[PDB]
Design an enzyme around this catalytic site. Structure first.
Site, PDB file in Angstrom:
ATOM      1  N   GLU A  11     -70.433  73.324 -16.980  1.00  0.00           N
ATOM      2  CA  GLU A  11     -69.355  74.294 -17.133  1.00  0.00           C
ATOM      3  C   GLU A  11     -69.223  74.863 -18.533  1.00  0.00           C
ATOM      4  OE1 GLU A  11     -68.009  74.011 -13.074  1.00  0.00           O
ATOM      5  OE2 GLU A  11     -67.844  75.476 -14.715  1.00  0.00           O
ATOM      6  N   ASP A  20     -65.627  83.388 -14.919  1.00  0.00           N
ATOM      7  CA  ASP A  20     -66.670  82.472 -14.490  1.00  0.00           C
ATOM      8  C   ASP A  20     -67.793  83.190 -13.749  1.00  0.00           C
ATOM      9  OD1 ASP A  20     -65.723  82.900 -11.861  1.00  0.00           O
ATOM     10  OD2 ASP A  20     -65.171  80.796 -11.600  1.00  0.00           O
TER      11      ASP A  20
END
Ligand SMILES: [Cl-]
Ligand SMILES: [Cl-]
Ligand SMILES: [K+]
EC number: 3.2.1.17
Length: 164
Positions: A11, A20
């Site tokens: 991440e 994202d």
């Protein structure tokens, strides 16, 4: 290696609101803020999540605090879900981290839908599970990450994360 280190690799760490892989506002270590296309909505949340009026930037400690909560919530979600709990219980600790990883990325509901893959995992047919897991939108949209997680389920080792 451990679930925290694993997810930190997958991440990244960003201190300002960013989008994202799906185009959704997020911050810190993969902390999804909202699926809303409104930045203000995302800012709202951030403030609610951190407990202060932030203006879209947080500190590292704050990022780590949301991450701790997020990892805990994923484990919690697997444990409360009738479809995931038995799979999680049947796995060794390395594979358990792989499942937590999937749930952190896609949510409890999302992973619980992976019926056939879940069944192969519970059967411990690793190679077959790995092939099956790859037949998914998840694999197609985030193939490098998915391959890492799948390798983890296939082998029960952290080989995909070593060197990272
Ligand atoms: Cl939150
Ligand atoms: Cl990827
Ligand atoms: K990310």
């Amino acid at each position: 290696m451990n679930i925290f280190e694993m997810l930190r690799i997958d991440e990244g760490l960003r201190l300002k609101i960013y989008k994202d892989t799906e185009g959704y506002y997020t911050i810190g270590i993969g902390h999804l803020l909202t699926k809303s296309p409104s930045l203000n909505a995302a800012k709202s949340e951030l403030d609610k999540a951190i407990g202060r009026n932030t203006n879209g930037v947080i500190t590292k400690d704050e990022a780590e605090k949301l991450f701790n909560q997020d990892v805990d919530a994923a484990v919690r979600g697997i444990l409360r879900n009738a479809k995931l709990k038995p799979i999680y219980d049947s796995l060794d600790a390395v594979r358990r981290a792989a499942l937590i990883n999937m749930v952190f990325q896609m949510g409890e509901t999302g992973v619980a839908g992976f019926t056939n893959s879940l069944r192969m995992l519970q059967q411990k047919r690793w190679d077959e599970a790995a092939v099956n897991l790859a037949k998914s939108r998840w694999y197609n949209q985030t193939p490098n990450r998915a391959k890492r997680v799948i390798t983890t389920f296939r082998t029960g080792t952290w080989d995909a994360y070593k060197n990272l």
